[PDB]
Write an enzyme that holds these catalytic residues in place. Structure first.
Site, PDB file in Angstrom:
ATOM      1  N   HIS B  53       0.809  -1.225   0.000  1.00 39.78           N
ATOM      2  CA  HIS B  53       0.000   0.000   0.000  1.00 39.78           C
ATOM      3  C   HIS B  53       0.843   1.276   0.000  1.00 39.78           C
ATOM      4  N   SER B  76       1.017  -0.468  -5.435  1.00 36.02           N
ATOM      5  CA  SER B  76       0.198  -0.725  -4.253  1.00 36.02           C
ATOM      6  C   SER B  76      -0.632  -2.006  -4.384  1.00 36.02           C
ATOM      7  N   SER B  81      -5.994   1.614  -0.892  1.00 32.13           N
ATOM      8  CA  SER B  81      -5.000   1.885   0.140  1.00 32.13           C
ATOM      9  C   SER B  81      -4.087   3.071  -0.140  1.00 32.13           C
ATOM     10  N   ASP B 129       3.241  -7.945  -0.092  1.00 34.27           N
ATOM     11  CA  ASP B 129       2.269  -7.652   0.952  1.00 34.27           C
ATOM     12  C   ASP B 129       0.928  -8.221   0.496  1.00 34.27           C
ATOM     13  N   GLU B 154       4.976  -9.326   3.831  1.00 32.82           N
ATOM     14  CA  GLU B 154       4.517  -8.393   4.843  1.00 32.82           C
ATOM     15  C   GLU B 154       3.401  -8.927   5.719  1.00 32.82           C
ATOM     16  N   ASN B 179       6.047 -11.270   8.513  1.00 29.25           N
ATOM     17  CA  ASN B 179       4.879 -11.176   9.373  1.00 29.25           C
ATOM     18  C   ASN B 179       5.086 -11.828  10.746  1.00 29.25           C
ATOM     19  N   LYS B 184       6.699  -7.621  14.858  1.00 31.88           N
ATOM     20  CA  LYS B 184       5.851  -7.252  13.732  1.00 31.88           C
ATOM     21  C   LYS B 184       4.429  -7.770  13.878  1.00 31.88           C
ATOM     22  N   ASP B 188       2.485  -4.591  14.956  1.00 28.76           N
ATOM     23  CA  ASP B 188       1.745  -4.068  13.813  1.00 28.76           C
ATOM     24  C   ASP B 188       0.344  -4.688  13.747  1.00 28.76           C
ATOM     25  N   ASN B 189       0.275  -6.009  13.862  1.00 27.30           N
ATOM     26  CA  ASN B 189      -0.989  -6.730  13.822  1.00 27.30           C
ATOM     27  C   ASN B 189      -1.927  -6.347  14.956  1.00 27.30           C
ATOM     28  N   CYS B 193      -3.572  -2.332  14.561  1.00 27.22           N
ATOM     29  CA  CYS B 193      -5.022  -2.411  14.419  1.00 27.22           C
ATOM     30  C   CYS B 193      -5.772  -1.742  15.556  1.00 27.22           C
ATOM     31  N   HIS B 299      -6.773  -9.006   5.123  1.00 24.13           N
ATOM     32  CA  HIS B 299      -6.149  -8.535   3.883  1.00 24.13           C
ATOM     33  C   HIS B 299      -7.000  -8.451   2.599  1.00 24.13           C
ATOM     34  N   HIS B 351      -2.080   1.977   9.824  1.00 16.35           N
ATOM     35  CA  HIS B 351      -1.395   2.050  11.108  1.00 16.35           C
ATOM     36  C   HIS B 351      -0.502   3.278  11.143  1.00 16.35           C
ATOM     37  N   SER B 359       7.789  -2.837  11.295  1.00 17.07           N
ATOM     38  CA  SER B 359       7.587  -3.764  10.200  1.00 17.07           C
ATOM     39  C   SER B 359       8.493  -3.451   9.022  1.00 17.07           C
ATOM     40  N   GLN B 363      11.457  -5.348   7.172  1.00 16.96           N
ATOM     41  CA  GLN B 363      11.415  -5.427   5.719  1.00 16.96           C
ATOM     42  C   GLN B 363      12.812  -5.209   5.146  1.00 16.96           C
TER      43      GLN B 363
HETATM   44  N1  NAD Z   1      -5.439  -4.455   7.707  1.00 21.94           N
HETATM   45  C1  NAD Z   1      -4.287  -4.690   8.336  1.00 21.94           C
HETATM   46  O1  NAD Z   1      -3.620  -3.776   8.818  1.00 21.94           O
HETATM   47  C2  NAD Z   1      -3.811  -6.146   8.497  1.00 21.94           C
HETATM   48  C3  NAD Z   1      -2.868  -6.389   9.483  1.00 21.94           C
HETATM   49  C4  NAD Z   1      -2.371  -7.669   9.704  1.00 21.94           C
HETATM   50  C5  NAD Z   1      -2.805  -8.746   8.945  1.00 21.94           C
HETATM   51  N2  NAD Z   1      -3.768  -8.545   7.947  1.00 21.94           N
HETATM   52  C6  NAD Z   1      -4.316  -9.728   7.216  1.00 21.94           C
HETATM   53  O2  NAD Z   1      -5.167 -10.549   8.036  1.00 21.94           O
HETATM   54  C7  NAD Z   1      -4.805 -11.921   8.163  1.00 21.94           C
HETATM   55  C8  NAD Z   1      -3.944 -12.106   9.399  1.00 21.94           C
HETATM   56  O3  NAD Z   1      -4.664 -11.884  10.631  1.00 21.94           O
HETATM   57  P1  NAD Z   1      -3.767 -12.041  11.959  1.00 21.94           P
HETATM   58  O4  NAD Z   1      -2.345 -12.235  11.614  1.00 21.94           O
HETATM   59  O5  NAD Z   1      -4.100 -10.962  12.897  1.00 21.94           O
HETATM   60  O6  NAD Z   1      -4.432 -13.427  12.428  1.00 21.94           O
HETATM   61  P2  NAD Z   1      -4.189 -15.011  12.208  1.00 21.94           P
HETATM   62  O7  NAD Z   1      -4.231 -15.388  10.783  1.00 21.94           O
HETATM   63  O8  NAD Z   1      -3.143 -15.537  13.110  1.00 21.94           O
HETATM   64  O9  NAD Z   1      -5.510 -15.522  12.883  1.00 21.94           O
HETATM   65  C9  NAD Z   1      -6.648 -15.945  12.161  1.00 21.94           C
HETATM   66  C10 NAD Z   1      -7.557 -16.459  13.257  1.00 21.94           C
HETATM   67  O10 NAD Z   1      -8.834 -16.521  12.645  1.00 21.94           O
HETATM   68  C11 NAD Z   1      -9.554 -17.692  13.010  1.00 21.94           C
HETATM   69  N3  NAD Z   1     -10.496 -17.973  11.889  1.00 21.94           N
HETATM   70  C12 NAD Z   1     -10.182 -18.551  10.719  1.00 21.94           C
HETATM   71  N4  NAD Z   1     -11.279 -18.837  10.010  1.00 21.94           N
HETATM   72  C13 NAD Z   1     -12.273 -18.399  10.762  1.00 21.94           C
HETATM   73  C14 NAD Z   1     -13.609 -18.544  10.432  1.00 21.94           C
HETATM   74  N5  NAD Z   1     -14.032 -19.131   9.302  1.00 21.94           N
HETATM   75  N6  NAD Z   1     -14.459 -18.070  11.356  1.00 21.94           N
HETATM   76  C15 NAD Z   1     -14.022 -17.519  12.480  1.00 21.94           C
HETATM   77  N7  NAD Z   1     -12.738 -17.393  12.789  1.00 21.94           N
HETATM   78  C16 NAD Z   1     -11.820 -17.842  11.929  1.00 21.94           C
HETATM   79  C17 NAD Z   1      -8.438 -18.698  13.188  1.00 21.94           C
HETATM   80  O11 NAD Z   1      -8.813 -19.680  14.154  1.00 21.94           O
HETATM   81  C18 NAD Z   1      -7.256 -17.875  13.696  1.00 21.94           C
HETATM   82  O12 NAD Z   1      -7.137 -17.921  15.120  1.00 21.94           O
HETATM   83  C19 NAD Z   1      -4.131 -12.053   6.837  1.00 21.94           C
HETATM   84  O13 NAD Z   1      -5.187 -11.991   5.878  1.00 21.94           O
HETATM   85  C20 NAD Z   1      -3.343 -10.760   6.702  1.00 21.94           C
HETATM   86  O14 NAD Z   1      -3.168 -10.597   5.303  1.00 21.94           O
HETATM   87  C21 NAD Z   1      -4.262  -7.231   7.736  1.00 21.94           C
HETATM   88  N1  ADN Z   2       0.264   2.623   7.243  1.00 17.44           N
HETATM   89  C1  ADN Z   2       0.397   1.563   6.435  1.00 17.44           C
HETATM   90  N2  ADN Z   2       1.257   1.582   5.405  1.00 17.44           N
HETATM   91  C2  ADN Z   2       1.704   0.467   4.836  1.00 17.44           C
HETATM   92  N3  ADN Z   2       1.361  -0.744   5.246  1.00 17.44           N
HETATM   93  C3  ADN Z   2       0.503  -0.863   6.267  1.00 17.44           C
HETATM   94  C4  ADN Z   2       0.007   0.289   6.815  1.00 17.44           C
HETATM   95  N4  ADN Z   2      -0.933   0.043   7.711  1.00 17.44           N
HETATM   96  C5  ADN Z   2      -0.978  -1.290   7.774  1.00 17.44           C
HETATM   97  N5  ADN Z   2      -0.091  -1.847   6.935  1.00 17.44           N
HETATM   98  C6  ADN Z   2       0.212  -3.297   6.754  1.00 17.44           C
HETATM   99  O1  ADN Z   2      -0.904  -3.919   6.129  1.00 17.44           O
HETATM  100  C7  ADN Z   2      -0.705  -5.321   6.146  1.00 17.44           C
HETATM  101  C8  ADN Z   2      -1.906  -6.073   5.578  1.00 17.44           C
HETATM  102  O2  ADN Z   2      -2.228  -5.577   4.265  1.00 17.44           O
HETATM  103  C9  ADN Z   2      -0.416  -5.453   7.615  1.00 17.44           C
HETATM  104  O3  ADN Z   2       0.479  -6.546   7.724  1.00 17.44           O
HETATM  105  C10 ADN Z   2       0.397  -4.208   7.955  1.00 17.44           C
HETATM  106  O4  ADN Z   2       1.714  -4.725   7.891  1.00 17.44           O
END
Ligand code: NAD
Ligand code: ADN
Ligand code: NAD
Ligand code: NAD
Ligand code: NAD
Ligand code: ADN
Ligand code: ADN
Ligand code: ADN
Lengths: 430, 430, 430, 430
Positions: B53, B76, B81, B129, B154, B179, B184, B188-189, B193, B299, B351, B359, B363
């Protein structure tokens, strides 16, 4: 000749039984291992020697080992950790127990020796918490190391020492890492301390937590758990550490982080969760606010130099069992709890039944793997099969009404794991 | 012929640079990589193509990579994003950028192809990512697989798709699981969040959190953070999990755990942290409260069935970019944020800089190993040297004023680690 | 003839005194009241007869009162709340104490009768907590209403009954509403229960609070404090209330509001902070999951229908003092606590010293006013001077190390209050 | 001649209305005042002039006032608090609005004047927030006082300036202290800032809360919420106060309480909830950490000496609307928010709809009292009847799924209250 068991007041047997039956109702896991292996008795021919605070919770464990066919000779790995009514029950149950509350360090060792020889010869299994049993035999009775099939370690201090013996070619028998077990470290260590630590400070000091400044040494599971307990009561928790990652966690959580050299000037309550010596020195007592309460949750008593105190205090007056108020040569007093030893298990009662079952479940599973698949475990310190790990948690979701979701084939195929199968990777860290 | 870069408004570069100057100050680890590896330029003769992103935070990472002497071609990994000024500055800094907020699926894949070839020839390093950069080449342009020296993932989705590619020998080049790095995943996670979710919820809906009912599907690092956020606002969070352990955790945290089928009737705010398909179906939408808010933080956008909505709703109106009010056939309405895509990076800014550095330092660290220690990394998926792991946290302690303690010889001996040396065991989970 | 005092074991005097010595250091307010009026002896000529749980904390109150030149005759306002070692000290100290833990109801009244007459004639002052002392005399010994100069009410219940006697024309003497005092209500009621409720459940049941469902009846200061305590251990708190403002509160706080009829089905630990009858009934008991724990933190034991259990439970076994396990006709077992009466004072030790000093200071403050400035208090129920109120909090800022700020003339002028003068309007609700 | 209204861009109507439609769904209180008094139209003949941040939530209050028969003229009590689409909707609606984000100090006044005269003549009712409208008339146009029937105050500052005018016999028209309404101060002031402050900072700086040191000056309802908000995000919060009771409060909450003088050196984020001037002086700026974030949440801009920065800073670069980065002579940078004015309304959207409805329900309730029951309201400043208070809350219980309990004859008789009747005594502080 020798004794069949040594407890405080065997007349406590009835009051402990009610206690035990009540605890059983909270110990879902443990009761599940009973209604599953009692008939098959997987631990038949086993003669277990344990060193674990003889608490009501340990009785539930000890009878679970006996229900599975095992023979058991017990001992408490603490002079203040024992719960006399839980002991005077196990004894009555017919299990030879050697443990009361407040044994002298001379008594402590005699109690452990009493559990090395059964009728059918010497022990063949070890259930340890702290490492006293596995080391007392590894250095004091090296002729028994051969007839011992497996070892189990309850706490971190015990598992850190094992890894040592290993790296120093001193480990002559295989040991399983129960502590490090997610469903063990991330529950008993964290959650368990979150409720037992202050229960210990309260019963002995009856201090008001709200308002005080508490200094916690170390930010491990026990630290994260302890810190959450005081902070949630109104206290201002400062934290000291030697680990960057852990140190960052504590700050990212709102906790100020510094050294005990500067923190000893603000704290009203000091708690050591550290695994090593000299956490709170005499150079720290000389700056503590009056009546500052000092305790230590870690396993052994060497986090708090209790010696400086007894050797540098104008006076020392014991308020009541395991509670001491010293008068420093500067005016201030320093209420010391449990003479520096485990505060939750010495001033209070330890972790709650529920949480305690999560660890004993793992302990029983371990005892069963070691005594039954000897080939699966070569001399060293092995973890416990994750499969068995995830099993402990699953056994407790019912008592909490936790309703797990269920993947479909559509999802299972999507994720790639079994709709009914495992997926909990070994990288996960929880 | 080809394009030098494709960005929304190059005239956004001035306002960006500012926003970028402010973030650098919050990204210490990144700066510490620069003030250490710019002269030695350890990434020399490197041609990195990354999918992440394009935000203000990804620009400090990008320019940190060029400082270390690399060749960067960005893009991206999300059509919403991107942060225009952040892309405008990068474009002006003369870096070939292809990315803007609000691209069509067809544009999103064009942008990726533009960063596959460099003057001196194709790419040789990948900074992913989500797995879309490592998959496109692995399946579309397999011939470049040879030139590629390493991979850097990522997010958890990329890493989940990595262990798979390996389990089916689909993976033709080693990659490092960034990750799963303590500094991280647990920062970050979880922390990340715990701040960027609600910001996206608010900035879009301006909704009141306190007093509502938030349904968070999945209790991972992300689920533990999102829940607390809402929960700290005055909301009643319900959690749905498939894993008992994770589930036990929530239940031990005071959260109510059930299924979505039963929880879709109570919730007001719906958040998906799960990484798999069909979390929120139509079977639910049909029971949701009037104007329920639904968003996905995982994601990809297959958690919430936006399809059903699109083809089962009476009328769908647009209040503002990424915000959509649907009129269900039962009269109830449903506000969809970012169309099922990442809500934090979609409706908010992602974030905060400080957590994003942890993170990004990882990287940069990864690429330096992959490109510089090929031997150490054979096709497959590897973890980053715990040593560098603990190095990231370290790099951030100063800015926080965290005062780390230091073991003496006495202690260093006791415990058994180096007063100055390592002692962080790999058993640790944090 | 008559008795000089009646305690459990005067051989506890020694232990109780150390316990008091530790408290005095924690009750800044009470000492300040001592170190201020023990020479001027403002309570000279007064003969106080109090009905407050005779605990260590109250010991310090009594000795402060006497230090102020007053004569005292004590009794506890609870058959289980007394702390025998604290009463054995007040006994040896020469003070007539008629209290002890576990008195019969027929004993509980006799103990109050002993504190009505002094050598110099009947009492002339009343320090009450519950309304038993002020009622006993109003309805039983009306001929003594003339000799009493004033009343001091500790708790809501008592001050609620005071407002009634008045509205009915039954109040024959003036009283002071101590409870409603800010540094008492929002400190004792809220913070005291936030720490002592749980400490009551643990010592009694040792139940793990994390993972349970805690049903709280009433969201008054005592409710908000019990909810927070339980909710910080990982318990799930459901609240029941009859007041919208209070109900909207719990709600806006993350709590679920419903009725006991529905709640009794989910609850694991039931706590009644309400001040009226029939909060938990058998119609409920017959729906409570297995071993549910039921306690009462309100003042009197009529919130829980104890009478039903006794006359409907298949069997009742007493695990240990103030702990009974009931077997209903459906199998399930109910763990009753304190026989329905105050759980913190009957199972634990009441509130911690620090918070009790705030309350106990207001108390000493009232007895000075009533007995010294009677003309200010005409038959009725009054409030303690807002000024004296604020003084209770100020006498504690030091022990907590609070560093208040100081306005300047420019500020003091700006607002319109005294840089040294008051400003805390009575509209303030804190 | 004169203008019918003045907005930034009437073209913003369409979208504003969409936001107004959605908000209506979150304001159960204001709509209830509609479905109840639109037909009986109680505000008939009223020409209301009101100064309040012209926001989406205000447009709802405004429209409720008109639905109840009241004429209206509006203006914002803030230069940056206006929300142009919510003002472009009220203008299109036909209501004469004179507001728009970013109005110089002179336009702010000219806008208020425009709302002083209606066709049928001058105003006969004032609905204020701050006291601007009410003072401007009292001192500039005293000839309208006779024609003004009543006043309604939204905030603390104004209410504090009303009791003042009274205490100086300068208050010529009866006003109602709406702020002090329980369902307003303990909801809008508290729960409102809990979400509004950080949303303001965030959108403005996008900084990371977790791991920072935040200094909140003044521990009032606003301080209680802002403190709790920053705190639950992972920030350490230092609190400054001049009131001993409010001070003890923060401390028993775990907050460290000191003086800006000491604090200024630690904090990273500085928030002012105090109600007076000179909170953060230059003497504080010269010691602040680099790029510290300063902002005020109180009503007016004199808590942060903005003038000093402006006249002592090397250079001041505008990061974007209401965001400035100042360069002191020591090289450090100061990120100033909203120029020192309300940070939640100047950089964010203010409090969420739900909470703004409790406050607005009281607002519409008072006008109906002042403009319909004058004899009930003499010159001075009164509280809205308690009965009406409880109504405000009760009117929001349904939306939150709250399920209040009902007393029975048995209990109502017990307590002495009306099973159906009231009991909320005025000694209650909530
Ligand atoms: N938006 C962001 O900033 C961001 C940040 C980190 C990770 N992500 C994305 O999110 C995922 C990672 O999440 P994480 O690392 O925090 O967690 P993770 O993958 O460790 O945990 C997933 C949890 O979800 C549960 N789960 C799976 N299927 C399910 C279902 N069908 N119903 C209910 N619960 C269920 C599992 O038991 C597990 O404990 C990846 O897709 C990653 O790409 C996005
Ligand atoms: N500010 C941001 N810029 C770039 N990457 C980010 C940002 N916020 C969240 N992320 C990353 O987004 C990933 C999931 O797409 C998460 O693992 C986190 O590492
Ligand atoms: N009281 C109980 O009932 C109970 C329960 C669990 C574990 N324990 C004991 O606690 C210890 C293990 O703690 P854990 O499992 O919670 O976590 P852990 O062992 O992971 O925690 C160790 C942490 O403390 C830090 N530390 C080490 N030396 C320090 C020093 N000198 N100063 C400051 N910080 C220091 C380390 O960096 C590390 O992060 C063992 O001794 C174990 O015996 C007791
Ligand atoms: N154990 C202790 O240490 C302790 C401490 C303080 C007060 N008390 C006792 O508490 C009561 C005073 O309470 P407080 O000062 O904490 O707060 P409070 O008196 O304001 O609490 C009363 C609340 O309980 C609610 N309630 C009343 N009837 C109800 C019913 N039938 N069902 C559900 N909810 C109902 C009321 O609406 C009200 O909101 C008195 O009994 C007093 O004697 C005990
Ligand atoms: N922006 C918003 O959303 C918003 C909302 C509500 C109130 N306000 C404003 O805040 C003020 C009142 O706030 P409230 O109702 O939350 O509470 P309040 O008026 O009770 O708060 C006043 C508190 O601030 C403290 N204070 C005063 N001077 C101080 C000083 N010099 N240093 C440190 N502390 C000091 C006082 O001791 C007092 O306890 C008014 O100006 C009102 O206009 C703004
Ligand atoms: N209630 C208890 N009974 C038995 N063992 C306990 C109990 N409480 C804590 N422990 C265990 O004590 C170990 C340290 O001695 C901890 O790891 C914890 O596992
Ligand atoms: N530790 C204790 N000692 C004396 N009184 C107490 C104690 N704990 C609580 N109380 C008081 O008991 C009253 C109700 O019985 C409460 O108002 C509280 O003030
Ligand atoms: N969203 C908003 N709409 C209108 N007024 C607001 C808003 N948010 C806060 N306020 C009010 O601003 C007042 C102070 O200027 C506060 O008392 C609060 O009532």
């Amino acid at each position: 000749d020798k004794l069949p068991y040594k407890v405080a007041d065997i007349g406590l047997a009835a009051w402990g039984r009610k206690a035990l039956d009540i605890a059983e109702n909270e110990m879902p896991g443990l009761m599940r291992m009973r209604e599953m292996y009692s008939a098959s008795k997987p631990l038949k021919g086993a003669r277990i020697a344990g060193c674990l605070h003889m608490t009501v919770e340990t009785a539930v464990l000890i009878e679970t080992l006996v229900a599975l066919g095992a023979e058991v000779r017990w001992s408490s790995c603490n002079i203040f950790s024992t719960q006399d009514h839980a002991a005077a029950a196990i004894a009555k149950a017919g299990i030879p127990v050697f443990a009361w509350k407040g044994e002298t360090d001379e008594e402590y060792l005699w109690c452990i020796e009493q559990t090395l020889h059964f009728k059918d010869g010497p022990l063949n299994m070890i259930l340890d918490d702290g490492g006293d049993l596995t080391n007392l035999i590894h250095t004091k009775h090296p002729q028994l190391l051969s007839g011992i099939r497996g070892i189990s370690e309850e706490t971190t201090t015990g598992v850190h020492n094992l890894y040592k013996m290993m790296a120093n070619g001193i480990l002559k028998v295989p040991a399983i890492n129960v502590n490090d077990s997610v469903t063990k470290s991330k529950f008993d260590n964290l959650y368990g301390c979150r409720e037992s630590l202050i229960d210990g400070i309260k019963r002995a000091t009856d201090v008001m937590i709200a308002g005080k400044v508490a200094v916690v040494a170390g930010y491990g599971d026990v630290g994260k758990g302890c810190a959450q307990a005081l902070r949630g009561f109104g206290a201002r928790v400062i934290i000291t550490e030697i680990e960057p990652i852990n140190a960052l966690q504590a700050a990212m959580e709102g906790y100020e982080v510094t050294t005990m050299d500067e923190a000893c000037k603000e704290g009203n309550i000091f708690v050591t969760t550290t695994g090593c010596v000299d956490i709170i020195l005499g150079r720290h007592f000389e700056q503590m606010k009056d009546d500052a309460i000092v305790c230590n949750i870690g396993h052994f008593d060497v986090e708090i130099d209790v010696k400086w105190l007894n050797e540098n205090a104008v006076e020392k007056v014991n308020i009541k069992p395991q509670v001491d108020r010293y008068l420093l040569k500067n005016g201030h007093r320093i209420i010391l709890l449990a003479e520096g030893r485990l505060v939750n298990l010495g001033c209070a009662m330890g972790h709650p039944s529920f949480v305690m079952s999560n660890s004993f479940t793992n302990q029983v599973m371990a005892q069963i793997e070691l005594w039954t698949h000897p080939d699966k475990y070569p001399v060293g310190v092995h973890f416990l099969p994750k499969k068995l790990d995830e099993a402990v948690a699953e056994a407790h979701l019912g008592k909490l009404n936790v309703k797990l979701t269920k993947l479909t084939e559509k999802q299972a195929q999507y994720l790639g794991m079994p709709i009914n199968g495992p997926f909990k990777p070994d990288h996960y860290r929880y």
